[PDB]
From Swiss-Prot:
Tissue specificity annotation: Photocytes.
One of the GO BP terms on file: bioluminescence
Annotated phenotype, changing residue 162 to V: In P9; increases fluorescence at 475 nm excitation. In R10-3; matures to the red-emitting state with excitation and emission maxima at 555 and 585 nm, respectively
Outcome, altering residue 143 to D: In Cerulean; leads to improved quantum yield, a higher extinction coefficient and is 2.5-fold brighter than ECFP
Species the sequence originates in: Aequorea victoria
Protein name: Green fluorescent protein
Its biological purpose: Energy-transfer acceptor. Its role is to transduce the blue chemiluminescence of the protein aequorin into green fluorescent light by energy transfer. Fluoresces in vivo upon receiving energy from the Ca(2+)-activated photoprotein aequorin.
PTM comment: Contains a chromophore consisting of modified amino acid residues. Maturation of the chromophore requires nothing other than molecular oxygen.
Gene: GFP
Effect of residue 150 to V: In EBFP2.0; shifts the excitation and emission spectra to shorter wavelengths and increases quantum yields compared to BFP
């Protein structure tokens, strides 16, 4: 099936066109993924200058096909089954007391690379609040994601809340809303409702002079 496209180490390209309050920017990302361990290792660069948001607010947007699916549930794996034709991923993210993101993304194979292309638009943000005022710590507090099949769209939806640590105290809520649909026409594994558990560690690279993000991530399903 598609599951076989991930048996070993795959390369990962992430491209991101964004516009937040008219602050326009871009992020490109390279890395690889090993679905057998749901291990992601990734570097992201603001190839346009300084990132007008804090890196953590883009972690979610910046590949759930790489999550390690234990043997007994390989049949619930929409993300690998949509491949290589891929899936669209649309999200809407509400930052409690600030604006929000609208993100479209195409997650397909291109040659041997898994490519996550993304458009991100944001409106209604306060220019001195925690997002545009760069007020969040460079840490990540993951949260599980409840995956639910959307039989009418032939794919899945999801709703989950990320907590962002606020410099000097507090947490910024980021209410997440997600649907995925398949791109190709093959059949797809519509899955039973389940969880995806993510641990995420953002580091820097001491030899990169651009505004950037090193990210190591693990995702496994249950």
């Amino acid at each position: 099936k598609g599951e076989e496209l991930f048996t070993g180490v795959v390369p990962i390209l992430v491209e991101l066109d964004g516009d937040v309050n008219g602050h326009k920017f871009s992020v490109s990302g390279e890395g690889e993924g090993d679905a057998t361990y749901g291990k992601l290792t990734l570097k992201f660069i603001c190839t346009t200058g300084k990132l007008p948001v804090p890196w953590p607010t883009l972690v979610t947007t910046l590949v759930q096909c790489f999550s390690r699916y234990p043997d007994h549930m390989k049949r619930h794996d929409f993300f690998k089954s949509a491949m290589p034709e891929g899936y669209v991923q649309e999200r809407t993210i509400f930052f409690k007391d600030d604006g929000n993101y609208k993100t479209r993304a195409e997650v397909k194979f291109e040659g041997d690379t898994l490519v996550n292309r993304i458009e991100l638009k944001g409106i209604d943000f306060k220019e001195d609040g925690n997002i545009l005022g760069h007020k969040l710590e460079y840490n990540y507090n993951d949260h599980q994601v409840y995956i639910m099949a959307d039989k009418q769209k032939n794919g899945i939806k999801a709703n989950f809340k990320i907590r962002h640590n606020i410099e000097d105290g507090g947490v910024q809520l980021a209410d997440h809303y997600q649907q995925n649909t398949p791109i190709g026409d093959g059949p797809v594994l519509l899955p039973d409702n389940h969880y995806l558990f993510t641990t995420s560690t953002l580091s820097k690279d001491p030899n990169e002079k651009r505004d950037h993000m090193v990210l190591l991530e693990f995702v496994t399903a249950d």
